[model samples]
Target chain A: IPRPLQRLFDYFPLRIYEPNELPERSQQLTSGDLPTLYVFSTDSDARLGLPSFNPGCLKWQTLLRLANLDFRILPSTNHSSPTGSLPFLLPPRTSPTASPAPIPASGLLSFARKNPWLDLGHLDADLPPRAQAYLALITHSLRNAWLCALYLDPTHDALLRRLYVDPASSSRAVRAALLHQLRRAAAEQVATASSGGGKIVSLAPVDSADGIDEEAVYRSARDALDALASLLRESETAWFFGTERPGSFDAALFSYTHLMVEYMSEEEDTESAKGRVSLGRMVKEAGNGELAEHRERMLGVAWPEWDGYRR
Target chain B: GAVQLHVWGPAFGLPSIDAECLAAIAYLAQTLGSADYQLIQSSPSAVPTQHLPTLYDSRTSTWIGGFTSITAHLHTHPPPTFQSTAASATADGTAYTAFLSAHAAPLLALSLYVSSANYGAATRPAYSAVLPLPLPWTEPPAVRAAMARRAAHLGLSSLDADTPEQKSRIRLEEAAREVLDVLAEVDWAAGGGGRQVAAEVRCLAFGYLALMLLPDVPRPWLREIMEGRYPALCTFVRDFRARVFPQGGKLLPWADGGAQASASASASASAVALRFVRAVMAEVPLVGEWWSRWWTARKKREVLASKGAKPAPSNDLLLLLGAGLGLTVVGAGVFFYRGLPPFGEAVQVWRKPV
Candidate 1:
């Protein structure tokens, strides 16, 4: 046979791998036996049975308990999640043949459906107009306040350092580097939140721009708390939306309400943290008795077992 | 002096181009008779809050912007609001307003800004038509970006984005359904013009509904949704819009073709060039704007990634070397040519008053 013709006959022939030559299959679902939930909490925090310091992580953390799902909490960052955000769920294997995908924060309800865990009954379906309005109220103004209070405030420096940056790496250099990047991202998220509609453009690449109006941040937050309190006052419910058990809405409200209450207590103890502006302080000054009362209600519901230390 | 509400100038035959702006105008028109207040066609940049629908009251020399602020101020100032809807949490319509803005905004963005076809065919041109000259360059995309961010929670970056068409369409449909659901939750979603009753909420709703339905875009997904599923809302918006703005929106002169020509003609060639560059860079998405930001971010990342890496020599350097050689030769000639008088000076002497 001609040289070219001989080569053509053997063109791209498939070859079966020998036993040793074959690539190893990823160890199928061995570790995630009990539906691991990746959160922002450290090992000690998890052991201490404390809620995640992150509003996003905490919201879902409470909701997971609210759903009564049996899941293991693992300390992870945005780096571990498929999406570049945290609070992802690594669903457990239902059968030897079954493998489930990870669920990011957005997919909590979807994840619940496959597991047949909790049907909290969509508030929009029941209350319609008010449900959606209030939900936006939480995610919009309240979410903005949470971001600003925790991310940008001076008082939160030590808390954020311990919560996110300190546990990142053992190296001093790595921690510093993480610290810089973390603040930049946190600031960016807050800036985008305050801007109209929602997210604003990242004007500069190297570093984020400043000029977040803390007054407006706290003011809107104060207003948000008032409106939220107004809603709770209007509705005759043990939980938000009057769910039979604590649901997503209750979980979300609890995340912020409890955090504010916890922080407000700390500020109350120390007077010189006096000038400090935070959602906690706002909650105090606003004297939202409804939110104050609801805070305890949510704490009891969300963490029935916790002794409440090391917030 | 009449209170002036500075807002986005009208387009698509509504009182204002922006939903919030229109809502403000509607409320002002309904509450403060035409004599008490007037609408001023304006932009968000003018306001301190960087928001539109600013209310300027010369009476107290106060500048109140944002629909909530203006509406809240209007509720109890120069004659309290006819004691309206004071019962529930939706008293000031704060939660409801935020809800409507958040939900309906994405659909508006998807149809008006995110969709390349609609943005180019209608929105960009409309923004150009409405905004002042320099603003049209940046404002449309800026506003569009905010909309994209608002919709980001839906996992939608842009309508004309990096996704399969079917999926994007489905996701977009889901967004439409969300807006529809929000509307249906309210009584007015099914019926048009609940005027005189729920006047405050109705105006804001009218603003959103009109902006969604009225615009004649190439990709009329929002319009189609309103028309198809919620005809009542459509009729409601149209009737309400008609009643509120019987003469339609009071637009800026630039919105008209006649004034646009004069302004366009007055523009310099450089302005034309930048506008063209912006048009190219802003549109043709998933590449143009994304590529620009990605390239910019990638450059910064690349800078950090390969730290202390010197830039290697390029063909341009060699070209510069040859050019430098030529410059040196010319310099040698100029330097020696009566060294006191430079070559150009010598030539100037030679041609003096000839």
Candidate 2:
């Protein structure tokens, strides 16, 4: 055959790369079935989010994994989700009796419980009061820091390049648009953290009209990290409750901490392309050695499948 | 001159239940055999660092606070006036100490402080017992505050503490496994074939067992890991405990009684209340369902046993009264039929006439 004919034969199949493969999605809901999770693409071939980089996605991923449900991730665009988010789950088609809608990021865990397949180890019912209180405080502080570091900080240039910028969409307008959306989302979260009638509300100014209270954000981050360290001290057990296996707490914690320790290392490049300080590195080092070590330990258990070497 | 180690305690069972304090005591006991030292029950806060097991050197008139500092001092000076066998005085000994510091110390600290059950049930109560009156009330919070500071130093805030406790546990377990790996690598053969051990292994084992001995430790999962998942560390801990505290070191006088096995076994009242609220609210059906099943099973079991069998037939007193009336009617009918019930009739007539 001629060279042109051979080339034509190769192109006839229109092969889809494994990473970009769009598996047949179900259009209905079922009583006891698994669902496809839509999430953003990660650098790893494994198709899992780097816990630190895309925390919302990581949160859902960890939750699903810990729940021990059968679900596969389908890399998706932000617009494809019902809430215009990445971490939504499209429930299996129902027989017209049950709702067949895509469960949004927030509803995934609760929705999972409806299915007989998912086993929730640490349901809200099982959590101790002290543990619950400690979690609210820790989550508030850690999230604030994460937002400040990734979106609000001046040093986020490196992270932006690493996480969002795709070479195909090199247009400045698209870049600016992505940045705008991220900044808006981060700003909103920071505001909520300050006013969200939890333990962190006291750490920030009650009525600060001035933009982001940088001082308060860092302070809460420090406080949260400290409290977490205290809570995490001296566990001779495999799980926090020392149960038979990992639970909701394990999933939630590993989702964020693993990413932090993995991405923000002391040896990471501290300068962005524009010579800005590395916000990622700063946040990574901010909590001190113990926090880093804590993240290290969490990563070891949560993602033991991850090789010890840095990617 | 004598070296006195001031620790918070009545040295009985689970003495020096605090991991750090326990580590210090164990290290000292191993380095300078138990015979040469005077152990005193003192306030942990009285020390400069505001921690327990502050060592006083009578000859040097020096005081060292904390397990870290005391161990370091022992490593540099040796024993009696600080001494150790030749094994710990060499390079391998140094590596062993480093391994403990790098891995086991943090692992130990995490077990006592980070492991929720151990901290809440065992560590806190042990510390609380040693505190004087009002301090007992205030000490837990104070110690927790101090622990928070320590945690920050250890970098716990790096984690989203708000994530469910179990979420970050994988990492904690990993951390423990890393330490266990080191224990597995211990050249037990090189250290005098089990009978004679390396100084570092001996010290590490002491610290490990001391941390383990606390009534709150070896949480079920941790116990599983030690005994099942990671047998090497379990063996080391067992071996170390047997060697060090042959008759069993004083276990901490757990405030809630000495039964460490069942610590927090019963769901707390608040926990039960919260569970009830959760069930009633219909937020978590499984918890509510589980509780209901347990309750119904209990009720059924109770009904099946003892004097009130068959659930008392819902009206025992009413049944008794009804039976009495029926018996009287039958007795009166029989007497009338037999022509002998005229006694009741005669008694009634006499009463009426009177």
Candidate 3:
């Protein structure tokens, strides 16, 4: 119950820069019972064209705007958004005057040749801690959707096998599914602890003075945060919050907590504000203690005054 | 004070929008005050694509789609003080004609519709009289979207002091400017509305205009808009041109039945239209007001001199060009990837029920 879903498009694999005819794309999924794997080939017709992959841009933009994360689309056309650096891949023969790789239909079906500040293609291996954490949260959240999709259907195993293992592309699907599963299991474990222990884990107090039964709300929220905090502590092994660096947990927690803070900060707070500061301090401290590089990397963190010492 | 009000829109339609509208009603607890406003209906496509109901993030640099309903999401601020609406529209030929009128602000929360039930129709439904204005946000869970479906509408325009009867139409026009203005700025957050609140609007309006003119546009003509003297609207149009026409094609201009034009003339007009949008968004009061609020907050008015907003600087145009081109590249990159960052994750998250 604590895990809420926004919307699910499991059966449908969106194409990039799609045209207005996209909503009609539902027919692609509904027409046949067979499962299909759609690779968002940025290479095919990979240019700054309309009704092709722009819908994919809207799709990514849409996803980023609404949900914090899970997966995103990258056009094979522009190598920049997917990464800050563009490889000195050969200059386009059409326009040698233009910067290398500025021409369309080039660099199709490519990921970052150079490192990006945040890379999802190689989630755990490439991304920095904070980014890794963020990617993990989204991936986990999306995986939850997959799990729920499976849960809803009686033929869950079939669904998994179909989507996760076509044999030839099993590596890619397995990677996606594995990350998704790890994140889900970690989140699920957190949920069970909060419910089973019934302990208060309020990182902050309710900001509003009225409407809600303060005591009940406070207890529940605190318990949830505490459960989450503890989950992060123990589930550090999970892909999102890998012990070495900020993984999926950091992303999910940051997104969710930041969202929570954004919503609650709209009103006056009795204890919530103080609690948020405290909670942030705890996480940062834990991060520094857990990851050797966290201190230098996660500088100017939420609590800047404190030393990098952690228990 | 946090003024609480609920809403619905073409996406959520009318009846389904009541729940959040009611919560907004409840939040107000009582009427803040009664004011006259206009409720204007917008086309399904008119709403910004970013704000349409969903769990994903939207592209950042350009408006991608011109959506009036989603102006607030990118800004992350409360809406205008005066307007109140629950609107949608029908596309009449080339333009979308919308209905506008005003009602008590509190009453806005009382009326809602099941927009989610008809989300698909709501997103695509169009009309000429009330030309569509796309937005950024999309469907919310439970249809408790910030948009509204009925009751009244308000259109804000600075052209003339028109009467209340003309409010919705006026507001829609003003909203057009606002959307355009949102698309004009340089900075933007991936899925969230970025520093330039008006950049999205510009992207949306000009993008549509460009799309309409795609068939009649030659590469050279579009390049004029991209490299012309008034290159303010260049980024959006270029992106749109790049997006719609990968290599080339011959689609009829205004296939919905508007006007005829040669590729060269069409490109020039498209460029001019973009220039008009840029000039208007920067100069006009109603439209400029949208950017003014957000822009002033980020940079000092004096600092604008660096890029040359004033003081009769000679290099101002160059500075402006530099700024515009810089963002154009970023926007182009965003479009190339098929979106802003965090797109897939955003989709996965937004689509999940909260």
Candidate 4:
């Protein structure tokens, strides 16, 4: 053959931009054998299948609910987890006596994407570019305020200790240590969110020796809510982006909005209500009744079991 | 005594390489006169935080590590303009700063660091020109990685030059499209907050935007996006740099000054042990150059390749060593010392009845 003719034999394949989702090992199971989500919860709460007290866990729990998947919630600790975070999913085993690996929260969205039986076509795949900005706004600006209010403020310490720590251990020393560690971790997280992450740099401290900028954080969150409210206004329909069905974005916002409202009601008697900028108050006082309306609608659909916190 | 400001040095005609460092430099230029402070081009290893953009307050004898911390330290009191809306302005600044860091920082990372064409051709050599010996070899690679990790969540894996040109362009276009929606919400002049925020809050915005628009990269994706789609932002950044940096930004000669890790006696035992191991690994092996090269290369690959969240900060190698040590102890005890001797053994006793 002529040298130039040899080039004709070459093979080329058209590239596909959409990468395949990560492999799913829990392939054989059906809706009858539901996956179990290990969340940050107490045994009593887990028994009732109540929502996780943790916003981080609750976000995923709500996302799971939105995906129309059948799953059960169970109480777990960071120690018992593979990724060292709660709200990891363990898909039903393939066989009667089989063990399946845990799927971390980081991969939970991908897991939802890959599930053959579920229909979440409206979530990550089809979301408009604008949703990314709103998501960043919620996760960073809003999330920072939530973290500072919940973690750094001393006024909420008693509530925090009661809600998260005291149930874990009987030993006072251990409980004290756990509380300190949790606060420190939240501080670091809030700091990271505020500064936008540095790969290796120590973020500016959330609560410096001089004390946190309490009023400033709340104002920022309120402004963030303002943007979110504007977004809600921009969309013609009830759901964000005018979707017929609520997607992960709704789940993400509801996680903060729902918790903020819930926590606000409890913090009314606390010093936080009087002196500090209340995140929950910001959530409710949106001039737009539509913001509250969206939250309530999401509560009915995404979190049907949600009742007023058992005082 | 003048306060010493330590930062990563100028690159691509910008005052600092890192965005955080650039913000600190901008604030330094804006807030403090040259007489009150000295700019020292420094390395991350110089501070307790192991970060650049550190301010050493000679009067207080303290080191401030981040841009926000330095800003807070320098301007502790409220200005006359701040009285009416101090809380609101501060809140606005915080929100806008976070917005800049989240939206704009990653695009800069993509243009200057993550894109192989740009880094290999322009950014890497720009680093080599300013960084000191040994560091030029090590630091550029390490710092390149920080950008990757910073921009990891964008999930724009297809933007690198290693991919097909058509696809790379498309992905870059898609990414730029996404970020434009974010930028539309930001007003560089209005400070992107409610009202006009102070100059301090907008420095990061200018810094990040300057890096994205001004730097001459082989893959000029960021520039293409800003100059083509958002010319007003380009105008804002260029004008901001001109107003803020009167001399078109100053690049001071770097002096090797900053914190070096001194193994203090009070250091954690595990930390001390880790260093000892590393030191021994470097010296004891004749393959010293190859040793760190492997780690450095692996770290770069890890930054690029890791798709999931970095697992909770634990040293797997240290844990593995501990596991091996425990197994050796137990295995030695089981294989060699399981049988017990009694006083009857001295009299040559037969097998004892159970």
Candidate 5:
């Protein structure tokens, strides 16, 4: 065959790998009776995007797994999502006559509740009011920090592009558009959290341009983690809500803290010498040894597959 | 052979970053089952007119550049699933879409390329991510110059020359408000207003809103005006984004990856090979550090292995043995001295001799 033809053939070939085979270890045996959870692709370094770093995706995966619901995974894009984001669920049809569609991340938990076998009603319901509020605070603070680390922080943002986006496939124009929107969204989100009667000063400059206030970001993140650590220490058991077993609060706590612990740079790591490199390191440095232990225990039980960033 | 449409990739809910490119895609999607048409994302510079998107019919070996030519070409040789009447209906609906684009595109361009705050916070980093290192860092001024020229062509020169940044910003705010009014009017005309904007108009308006309502456009006035003053437009934008892009549109990170992939692919294979040399030459410190570290680690490992193979007593062991021997000698001497003479008598004799 001619060279061009061969290249074309390479680009478009007989399919061997299904969407499930696309890496991230979510690829597994397909049980027809199972609900399909669409997640960000983890196999390819370039196309991984937020899924590679975002804890929200992992939290949902952990939630589903903990529920012991039979489900398969497929690489998904937010484009087809009802809410325009990932971690959506396509539950199995009820009567085999109904059309199948995906439910947004916001609604997936409730859907799980409807199924008695999942036994997930107590996930959040069992939490005390104080624990619930604390969890909310942790979620807000950590999410802000995560956004900054992944989008606003210059060093991490550079790595983010390399790890998430396939630079080779996207056009400069498209990339520019993506960057503009993401940065805008991230800055907006950070600004909202900072100004919403919170201790965090906005990470972005007042003029809405120029550099990030990384010190302020790290400081606020450290403060939040410190609070969470103290709260966890006060609890009788290892779980955030002091439940007999890990519940939704634990799942949520694990998502954010574990993300920082597992993904972010360590204090001794070379990257940290440059500046406050990792949100995880900042949190860890703020005397959160218990949080680290919490993460380790969670990993030992639930998501044992995620060891860290290793090629 | 398949029909492939080349456009800039989706950002937010917009089909392309460029309004013209988006209008073209919207038109195409209207006339045909968009699923049958493969969308190939390319930059504005890649197209013949330095615009996106162009249409390529593989079966006919035909290339149609720009929206005008694409629509014309499609009219002559319709696709298998093409709707003939869809064009007229689209013309009616897209008139509002075109109107929105015309009014909003200039502001969008100015916000992205001309406004220093927006450019620095959003546009610059975004472009830098995908473009070669130096281009994003250094060539932004040139790109902005070109964009400024485009903005002038789009009739934003009136705002361009406005003295005192505050006044210019105020003008933009007022214009944004006016745009909001028009958006409401269009939506109301389509049906009971708000998110019920006509499908054809909504597609165009979606692209326009995606550009205008960019979260960090450095235009707080516009955001407040849109979010607070114009709640209907907000509903329209949110609804359109969810309805059109479905999965929160492809996040910007994905587009950057796609851009990088194409950049690497576009370069000749030899260029890729040469990149190693080019990269090595450029990073003198990196190469030097790497070579030194490699050599030092290798030599250190070799020496350590040699020492291990020989199995000499380590310093710790030697030190321990010497200490043990010294203690034994001192003990033996003390015992022998004690046995030889009573301590008190020996001391008295030594003192007398002294």
Candidate 6:
């Protein structure tokens, strides 16, 4: 492809939620049903102006429009809090206001301070012993997404994992370290953003598939995308919430579901994978006409023409 | 097709820093070959990048700025804040002093994009395919640790740590760092000078960090950083003195005036001066205006309440009236400054004979 065309084509697919009256026929999953996990994925380079468009707010509006019940949104940073990546949330079901819901006053820090990864050993150990694992996972995923967006080093991940997973370890030192990393990364990102004239444009080759000599690099990135997509999609399955539905589950699903479809579709054939399932379709299948319409509108909206420069 | 990794900053007039950053991103992308990643940059406005870590929300936008400030702040503060606007990395005592100084260059907002024929209008078989790359976002831990050390030395360089009788080493060390930062701001105008303003911001950050971390730490240290007595806490008052006067009171004998003079002292002074000037320029009006408005509003409310001649208005109604009056005053002030003082005066109540 020509350089100019490459610039235009490189813009990722778009999503914009629209408001619609929910259909009364939508089925409501009851709390007595078995627990299900839903995974949501996205390309991670989201350009949606949430301050104006607010994909999460739109998702909530869509949910109210659909009025689906029996699931609680996983409450990742995306849906419930301002610190999330995907504009997704789960459907709230009536259940345990039971154990104090883990909505920390300071976004996901409370969640992070708990669930010390070392104490729990690994992800497998940390997840099973807790009823709030799904919530924790949503929180964890958002933080990781932030690290991904912030472009943090892998070592910091170890620190954050320790900070968030192992509740036993004193986080005094760990939290400070994490904050420092976040502050410095944010400063640079801010500077870069400032220089870019407020446009997220990159002036480099968009790694032509035909031209890229290092197939390994390209393939590795594809594999990472696949893994991330897979991991995120897990929530869409059974067993995320509980045997009965929770009120806040659907918000988490919607939050990431749209992102999944958008990001996973970047690869030509990657959409067919389990991670690429569309949240729009899920809501539609679940009989959320309000959400279905919103999702369809999001799909139909025009995205910005992302122009690039070859610096 | 071989893929070439290109890390980029915001696109405008490109500078050398842009290339360096892009190269770093490219190196990381090429090496890691991770699929899902986004680019980060700073905002032109003061809106902080760290404030909005999660770029997933469609309604949200922030400075996807680099982690220079973020990292520097984290190095000392420990743990993480979704946004640490208050942490001081430089001894300049500014909130995020090192951060503001280091990331003077602009940044790119975080986003991921890949070249693919799959996206176009006609839907040809496929756009050329390249491997998707994770934009390795944050600084390496080693780099962060180094920056932290650099910050510590920047503020505490003159303080002699090797001495035998420095009773409160840790306290003095912390104080030396804080005071040096405040002094740097005072001397260099590093923290966007606002008189004792940057010190106040640092104080806020120090207090915040202390409260967050030293939940059990005695109130004494907390009082010191807050009350701007951090410098006094240290035994190395001389070290703090060194940063204040770089020339050691008088120029070296070899460095005479005119052509023989060393430009180092002059340049350092100018840099700090410029920074302080900029800080003062941005803040004086804002601070003055805030206090002026507060005082004026309070005075007016008191007079009106005491008069009690008119009907007693409900609190909600009075609040609405106050807001309207305040906005009118602000609008008037703008007009006054813009050479339309009459328009501004018109916003005030018309005179009536008692």
Q: What lDDT would each prediction earn against the true structure? A: 0.63, 0.51, 0.28, 0.64, 0.55, 0.28
Model 1 lDDT, full chain set = 0.63
lDDT tens digits, residue span B110-188, model 6: 0001101111211111111110111111111112222233234233222222244365446444543433343333322
Q: Write down the C-alpha DockQ for each prediction.
A: 0.20, 0.02, 0.01, 0.12, 0.01, 0.01
Winner by TM-score = 1
Error of 2 at A248 (Å): 2.5
Number of the candidate with higher DockQ, 2 or 5: 2
Task: List residue ranges in candidate 4 displaced over 4 A.
Answer: A1-47, A53-57, A60-134, A141-250, A256-311, B1-4, B78-93, B157-159, B190-198, B251-354
Name the 10 consecutive residues with the lowest summed lDDT in model 1 chain A: A197-206
Candidate structures ordered by lDDT, highest first: 4, 1, 5, 2, 6, 3
The sequence of per-residue lDDT tens digits that candidate 2 reaches over residues A173-258 is 88787776767666655544321111111111112212344444554454444444434443456455555565666556655565
What's the DockQ of model 4? 0.12
Give the C-alpha interface root-mean-square deviation per candidate. Answer: 6.7, 20.6, 23.9, 9.5, 23.5, 21.3
Stretches of candidate 3 above 4 Å error?
Answer: A1-228, A236-311, B1-6, B9-291, B294-354
True contacts kept of 3: 0.00
Docking quality category of candidate 4 according to DockQ thresholds: incorrect
Query: What tens digits encode model 4's per-residue C-alpha lDDT throughout A1-311?
Result: 67876676554345547545334542332222677888877778776777777878988988877877667887777887787878799888675445578889977877876764556666555554446655776888778787777777776788788877888899999999998888867765554432422323211222221123334356557767876776676678889888898887888888888778777545545535455446676777664755677788887887677776422
Q: Estimate, for each residue in A92-126, the C-alpha lDDT of model 5 and write its tens digit.
A: 65643343677777777776767645556755464
Give per-model TM-scores.
0.70, 0.36, 0.21, 0.58, 0.39, 0.22
Q: What digit string (tens of lDDT, one per residue) describes model 5 on residues B1-354?
A: 256666654443354565555656665555677455666665433332223455667776554544544655676787788884333233234334334533465566676776666677776765555444433433345446545543554444433423477776666666665456656654532445333334444555656666667546554455666777767667767765565455544432222244345454433456434433432442355454343233323332333343233323335567669989999999999988786855465344335563
lDDT per residue, candidate 4, B1-354, as tens digits? 256677766777777777778887777666655455667766654443344676776665565556766676566632222221454444445545656667677777777878888889888887876654444555566577666655666766524533377777777777776766556555667544524556776787777777777888766777877788887778878888777765656433233322121112213466444433543454334655344434333332342233222424546589679989999999998977557565365456568798
Residue-level lDDT tens digits of model 1 in A206-269: 1232334344456566666777777776667766666556656666777777776565345544
CA lDDT for candidate 4: 0.64
Candidate 3, residue A206: lDDT: 12
Q: Candidate 4 chain B: worst 10 consecutive residues by lDDT?
A: B257-266
Whole-model alpha-carbon lDDT for candidate 2: 0.51
> Could you give candidate 3's per-residue lDDT for residues B236-341 as a string of tens digits?
4455444432332122121112112121222344554543343245335464543422332222222223223443334447867998999999989888888546
The DockQ leader among the candidates is 1
Per-residue lDDT of A81-116 in model 3, one digit per residue for the tens? 333222112221332122233312123213222322
What docking grade does candidate 3 earn?
incorrect
- Lowest summed lDDT window (length 10), candidate 5 chain B: B251-260
Error of 2 at B280 (Å): 51
